Subunit: 330 residues, 4 copies
Amino acid sequence: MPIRIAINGTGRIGLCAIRVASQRKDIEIVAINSTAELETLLHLIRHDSVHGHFEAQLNADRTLNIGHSKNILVLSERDINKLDFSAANAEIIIECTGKFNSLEASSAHLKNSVKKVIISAPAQNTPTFVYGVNHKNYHNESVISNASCTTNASAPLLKILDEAFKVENALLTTIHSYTNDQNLLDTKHKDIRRARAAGLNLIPTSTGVSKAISLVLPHLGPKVTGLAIRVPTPNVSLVDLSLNFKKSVSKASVQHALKDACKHAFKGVVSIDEERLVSSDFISSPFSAIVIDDQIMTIGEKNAKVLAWYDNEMGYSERLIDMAQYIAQN
Amino acid sequence: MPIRIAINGTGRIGLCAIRVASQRKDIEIVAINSTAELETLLHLIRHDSVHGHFEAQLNADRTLNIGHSKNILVLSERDINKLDFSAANAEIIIECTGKFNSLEASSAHLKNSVKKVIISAPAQNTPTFVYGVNHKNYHNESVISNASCTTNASAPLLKILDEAFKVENALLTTIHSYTNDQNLLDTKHKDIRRARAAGLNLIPTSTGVSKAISLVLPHLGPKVTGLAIRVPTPNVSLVDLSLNFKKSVSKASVQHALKDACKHAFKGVVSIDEERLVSSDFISSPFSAIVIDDQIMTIGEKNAKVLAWYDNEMGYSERLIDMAQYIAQN
Amino acid sequence: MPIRIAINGTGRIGLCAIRVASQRKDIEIVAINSTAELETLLHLIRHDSVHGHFEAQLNADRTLNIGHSKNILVLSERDINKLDFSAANAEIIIECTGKFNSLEASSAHLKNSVKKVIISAPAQNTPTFVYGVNHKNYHNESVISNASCTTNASAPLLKILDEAFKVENALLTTIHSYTNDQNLLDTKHKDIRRARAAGLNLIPTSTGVSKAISLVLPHLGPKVTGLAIRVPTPNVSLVDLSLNFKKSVSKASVQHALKDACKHAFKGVVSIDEERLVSSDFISSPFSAIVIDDQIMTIGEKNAKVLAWYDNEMGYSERLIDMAQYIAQN
Amino acid sequence: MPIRIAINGTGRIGLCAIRVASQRKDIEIVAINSTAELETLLHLIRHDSVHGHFEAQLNADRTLNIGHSKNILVLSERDINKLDFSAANAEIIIECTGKFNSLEASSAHLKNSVKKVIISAPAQNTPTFVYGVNHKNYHNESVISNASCTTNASAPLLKILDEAFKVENALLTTIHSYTNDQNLLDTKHKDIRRARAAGLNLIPTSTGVSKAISLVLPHLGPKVTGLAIRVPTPNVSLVDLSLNFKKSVSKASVQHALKDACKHAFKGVVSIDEERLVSSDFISSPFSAIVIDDQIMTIGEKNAKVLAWYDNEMGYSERLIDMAQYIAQN
Ligand SMILES: NC(=O)c1ccc[n+]([C@@H]2O[C@H](COP(=O)([O-])OP(=O)(O)OC[C@H]3O[C@@H](n4cnc5c(N)ncnc54)[C@H](OP(=O)(O)O)[C@@H]3O)[C@@H](O)[C@H]2O)c1
Ligand SMILES: NC(=O)c1ccc[n+]([C@@H]2O[C@H](COP(=O)([O-])OP(=O)(O)OC[C@H]3O[C@@H](n4cnc5c(N)ncnc54)[C@H](OP(=O)(O)O)[C@@H]3O)[C@@H](O)[C@H]2O)c1
Ligand SMILES: NC(=O)c1ccc[n+]([C@@H]2O[C@H](COP(=O)([O-])OP(=O)(O)OC[C@H]3O[C@@H](n4cnc5c(N)ncnc54)[C@H](OP(=O)(O)O)[C@@H]3O)[C@@H](O)[C@H]2O)c1
Ligand SMILES: NC(=O)c1ccc[n+]([C@@H]2O[C@H](COP(=O)([O-])OP(=O)(O)OC[C@H]3O[C@@H](n4cnc5c(N)ncnc54)[C@H](OP(=O)(O)O)[C@@H]3O)[C@@H](O)[C@H]2O)c1
């Protein structure tokens, strides 16, 4: 029987998770909790400024019908303690609100029929897994984190390149699309750079590179650090890794190592672009990272720069649902 | 003695009102209520992605020092009933939060030293005045509205052109910069077009043209209607009036009527651009409307199109403080 | 046999015309003249920042293979007098360069196998036709113009509404995406507003409304005028008609007149949006105009505002190829 | 007597060079060659979408009057062989067209009164100098290059950090505003990524890091490489250096080394931002590089990431005029 999931929260990631899950024959979306009105939820699923149009219908009983998920119950309850997925018999919650990113907070979902929660973000005190990196270490934990979109792009690359050449240290920059955490126009924010108009500025902002890699690749965590620069694009981001290796490298040898991994251990997760594409070309791409083959470069015997694209909404959401399928069966 | 004002709310309009008021020798900003931390408030006053840099300092006692307002008390209380401007002896509140846009709601400010409130938006059941249009009809009301930025641009023009040529009917479109009411990326909104990414789309949205003009120009209210189109610019808007008159008009005669008004009854309020400028050129302009002289056109004997720029933040904020000065002395 | 066309010029309109024509079973694109290198042309056909990805292949003999056009000869000759489509046996040229927009200039294509030219723009001294408006008046002219994208949106609407209610006068504004005629950053231009950065500004610019309507709807030409405002979107535009009629109108009656026309005389040309969409939703739409049903409004007995979307690249290009099919058979 | 310069070409860099030079009491702009009409040139000098408004006047004899340059002759001759600055007695040409970036091409300016040329770009076979890096090695060469804006930002930083810690290798990424070399919408370009719409995409593009550093810091040239990512901002860029040193470093020690250099050998050239600003805050900044103090980071004993802002138009133009003053007196 298809795995019975519910999506909590219908902003960018929840909307993308709905669309992704609707296309998976082994999944059934049995419920969605949204703070939007039903008709507005349907409208947002159907029409996306970046990703285009999507088929979705309202059944006669006012459940939704999307892809393989023909009977989706729509809820609207912000209070996680009042929220009740029982009428839908949900087993796995995809937690996409941004408001319960901790073990303690998301553990409130564990009641009634619900067995497991996957949090769409780094989460305090929560077992963290990245598909293709450390997901096989999963051991029946009931609440897990799928890390960040940047960690999903960078951890595969670090694992591949460490296995090939042995990472001594690396520095990461992500040139990253703006998100709904940012401000349209200059106004209060906890981060005084994210305070500033997102569409007008280059905005350096921390990202917890060292700590994230430490969770999924413990040996590499102390060896890497980095930051983000938010820029005026609405979706698709670019990780830029500057690496120092133990083994000597060339542009060609780095290219070959990455291509080999895409054929083998990272098939479906990492890809290679040899066509000289730009960010908009990767809208809706399902990969965690798409290496920019022609821009790989080396200097000295031991250093390389590797860039890779990722659709920070869709690649991540594909991984969320990959992880739901994995933890249900393992 | 300078008029003692306090600014409630420090988003776009509150920040602009602070800067404007700081430059008026007849005003003293005695307090600001902000949900930002003090250092963040100071940072936002000083550095604006659109308007540039502004001088502002922190005094030794942690009041702010800005222009002619050398001793500004900073408060941080969201609850209007707990908020207390007494230590600053504020007399007029400039209400800029967007959360108390009604007579009943803003009347909560009327306590202690506070005599009057000016609301930075249309407000339910509230006496509404536009400077240069109907402000001389003010009659000591304690809570008033300064209408919208679009009404401040369009009502002067309608009054001028009606006086000259007699408006039979008019249709208004504003091509308007995005605001913080909009969404960065597609997500819930009460208005399903304002739901959609502000930086990516042309977004038709109602604006209550008929009702606003009815308040400030009662005879014209039943004769005009219109709408807004939000577009991907961060500031500066453009009103487009399509008018049908009783008297015959030419491009020249419309031009002359508008220019004459700028010399006389609308001096300092309406201006004329003869230099073929574009929207960015009007950042920080203090006028309610800047007519685009060369783009005036007529068709038939009786119809004209008139365009005018306005800085929807700064022109409006200049008027807010003009109105504070007026109601304090009248 | 399919109609043998060649596309001259591969900028925005030429690229779109290629894609459109490739999907028409009654057309064969037998040649393309491009100033790009072959591989770059193929790349531009395949990958579009706005319109997404398109299938296109290089045959073993280095002709292109796109849709129903399996053997497209690629030329690269800027000089219209040296350019020779003979090896491809082209019969109709779709002239998309922007550099030969006159009867005299485009008449240089009339040699060898070429019978007819359709110019992708208003053109001096050239018979002008808009599909659904006056195309049935075509009378075997060898060089014609397909007018502008704005005329293709506005002339259908004016014809519909005139037939229903009798236009006395109308004023048009188009809120229009930027085009490659504009400047990325402030620099020389013949139009000192189009000189200014396209992505940063609202840019009023003439458009020859009166003269265009005069060509296709002679009785209405003296009754209408208007202008354009270029804004920071890359594609999709919005026409805003403010009309004064002889017959009395209501919002409902205008809505009904437009809907009826879409079912009948403007089927496939004009459509109606009842779903409260925004500009990005109309990317790649084939219609000349998509009326915004909910934003129709009236004031007084005789005046209405009507808005309609159009994809200024794709709707226009669909019409270009519609006109090629029509003039080949008529 | 003030140094008599002429500016050849009035796009972004030429316009900025005019404005900069006009404010230098030791310079006289005696002529400008522009392909714009005189009134359009004046308009572009006066009104800038990014940099704001500038005072400039037309004298009675139709020379320009700007700052300290009260009698500027305006020419309009594209052909460098016909162009003649004799009536103005120009001694130094600031070559800003982008069309003569070679020793051979720019040597055509050396005639009549002209003694020296400074090219606003890397130039083939041309002695290259960066102010504060290697300009004191100037030895009366008549045609020189001022390198690129990125080299002006990165070479000071590399020199400072090499002197302090000894660079073993470095990798550079510049997150760079779009320029007029790019395309508004997807169309032909020699670089198939720069072909794609500048305002819509992240666009990786080569930049000749290794070769440039080799010219100005020969010992470091073989040790560094990198690339650019063009993004949707109109001005202000960010260099991101990932460095491996011989000496051990900390965040603090890197911070201190950079701050010390700004007080001493790079005063007026490199600055430090301790105020957590964003890109728009550096519009019109005169520095070659503004280090982002709080975002410096280290990993391992030997690696650091250093970011720095630069206004790619204005910082560079300040250096152009600094170099004109230097080569005139040395
Ligand atoms: N690229 C990305 O966007 C990306 C990638 C990976 C992970 N993430 C992470 O995923 C999380 C969500 O990000 P997002 O970009 O999707 O944010 P978003 O667009 O702001 O969406 C979050 C949504 O959650 C809703 N919500 C808040 N509290 C709720 C509640 N108690 N019950 C139901 N709905 C509630 C909000 O609605 P209201 O406005 O009504 O409160 C909002 O629409 C964040 O932690 C983020 O860091 C984002
Ligand atoms: N062009 C314009 O922007 C324009 C022109 C004329 C009039 N208006 C009107 O003016 C109002 C404000 O607009 P805006 O553009 O300035 O909005 P904004 O940028 O969103 O600013 C509003 C600010 O109010 C703060 N706030 C909310 N509740 C508060 C409270 N109880 N006490 C103190 N601060 C509080 C918000 O902070 P939190 O996020 O912490 O809640 C926010 O920073 C709206 O009614 C708008 O329609 C705007
Ligand atoms: N929305 C629209 O974009 C739109 C809609 C309707 C009509 N139009 C009209 O259609 C025309 C083309 O507009 P567009 O937007 O497609 O412009 P565009 O993107 O600038 O494309 C024009 C292309 O023509 C090429 N070209 C110039 N001279 C040529 C020659 N002699 N032979 C071959 N190719 C040549 C140019 O290449 P080089 O750079 O190598 O010269 C350029 O790539 C204009 O008249 C425009 O007004 C445009
Ligand atoms: N950030 C920057 O923008 C930056 C920084 C440092 C260096 N640079 C370099 O400086 C150069 C200029 O760049 P830019 O950004 O200023 O380019 P731009 O904005 O395109 O300006 C170049 C100008 O040169 C004019 N021109 C071309 N040939 C001419 C001639 N023979 N005589 C007179 N004027 C002529 C062009 O006018 P027409 O269109 O009429 O031909 C155009 O307005 C390039 O080599 C660039 O790499 C740029």
